[PDB]
Protein backbone atom coordinates (compact mmCIF):
# COMPACT_ATOMS: atom_id res chain seq x y z
CA UNK A 1 0.00 0.00 0.00
CA UNK A 2 2.20 2.81 -1.30
CA UNK A 3 0.18 5.87 -0.35
CA UNK A 4 1.67 9.30 -1.00
CA UNK A 5 0.86 12.37 1.04
CA UNK A 6 1.96 15.99 1.30
CA UNK A 7 3.72 17.66 4.31
CA UNK A 8 0.33 18.36 5.88
CA UNK A 9 -1.62 15.12 5.81
CA UNK A 10 -2.66 12.23 8.05
CA UNK A 11 -0.13 9.46 8.64
CA UNK A 12 -0.28 6.43 10.96
CA UNK A 13 2.26 4.75 13.27
CA UNK A 14 2.95 1.96 10.76
CA UNK A 15 3.72 4.64 8.25
CA UNK A 16 6.14 6.40 10.59
CA UNK A 17 7.87 3.08 11.28
CA UNK A 18 8.14 2.54 7.52
CA UNK A 19 9.34 6.13 7.07
CA UNK A 20 11.90 5.95 9.87
CA UNK A 21 12.71 2.28 10.38
CA UNK A 22 12.54 2.79 14.14
CA UNK A 23 10.22 2.00 17.03
CA UNK A 24 7.11 3.86 18.23
CA UNK A 25 8.87 4.93 21.43
CA UNK A 26 11.58 6.64 19.37
CA UNK A 27 8.91 8.32 17.25
CA UNK A 28 7.00 10.12 19.98
CA UNK A 29 10.22 11.26 21.67
CA UNK A 30 12.10 12.22 18.52
CA UNK A 31 9.16 13.92 16.81
CA UNK A 32 8.42 15.96 19.94
CA UNK A 33 12.08 16.99 19.86
CA UNK A 34 11.68 17.78 16.16
CA UNK A 35 9.29 20.70 16.56
CA UNK A 36 6.52 19.27 18.78
CA UNK A 37 3.93 17.14 16.90
CA UNK A 38 1.01 19.01 15.39
CA UNK A 39 -0.35 15.50 14.92
CA UNK A 40 -3.86 15.03 16.19
CA UNK A 41 -3.41 12.54 18.99
CA UNK A 42 -6.22 12.30 21.51
CA UNK A 43 -6.18 8.72 22.77
CA UNK A 44 -2.52 7.71 22.67
CA UNK A 45 -3.06 7.30 18.94
CA UNK A 46 -5.19 8.79 16.15
CA UNK A 47 -3.65 10.59 13.17
CA UNK A 48 -0.16 12.01 12.79
CA UNK A 49 0.79 15.02 10.72
CA UNK A 50 3.56 14.27 8.25
CA UNK A 51 4.95 17.76 8.94
CA UNK A 52 6.15 16.48 12.31
CA UNK A 53 8.07 13.84 10.43
CA UNK A 54 9.59 16.44 8.14
CA UNK A 55 10.67 18.58 11.08
CA UNK A 56 11.90 15.64 13.17
CA UNK A 57 13.70 14.09 10.16
CA UNK A 58 15.29 17.48 9.69
CA UNK A 59 17.19 17.30 12.98
CA UNK A 60 18.27 13.68 12.49
CA UNK A 61 19.17 14.22 8.84
CA UNK A 62 21.24 17.22 9.87
CA UNK A 63 23.12 15.31 12.59
CA UNK A 64 23.24 12.11 10.52
CA UNK A 65 22.11 9.62 13.17
CA UNK A 66 23.54 6.14 12.97
Swiss-Prot record:
Transmembrane segments: none annotated. One of its GO terms (biological process) is DNA recombination. This is Probable excisionase hkaC. The gene is hkaC. Excisionase and integrase are necessary for the excision of prophage from the host genome by site-specific recombination at the att site. Belongs to the phage alpA excisionase family. Disulfide bonds: none annotated. Keywords: DNA recombination, DNA-binding, Viral genome excision. GO terms for molecular function: DNA binding. The keyword tRNA-binding does not apply. The keyword DNA-binding applies.
Amino acid sequence: MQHELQPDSLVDLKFIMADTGFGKTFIYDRIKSGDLPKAKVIHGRARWLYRDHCEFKNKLLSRANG
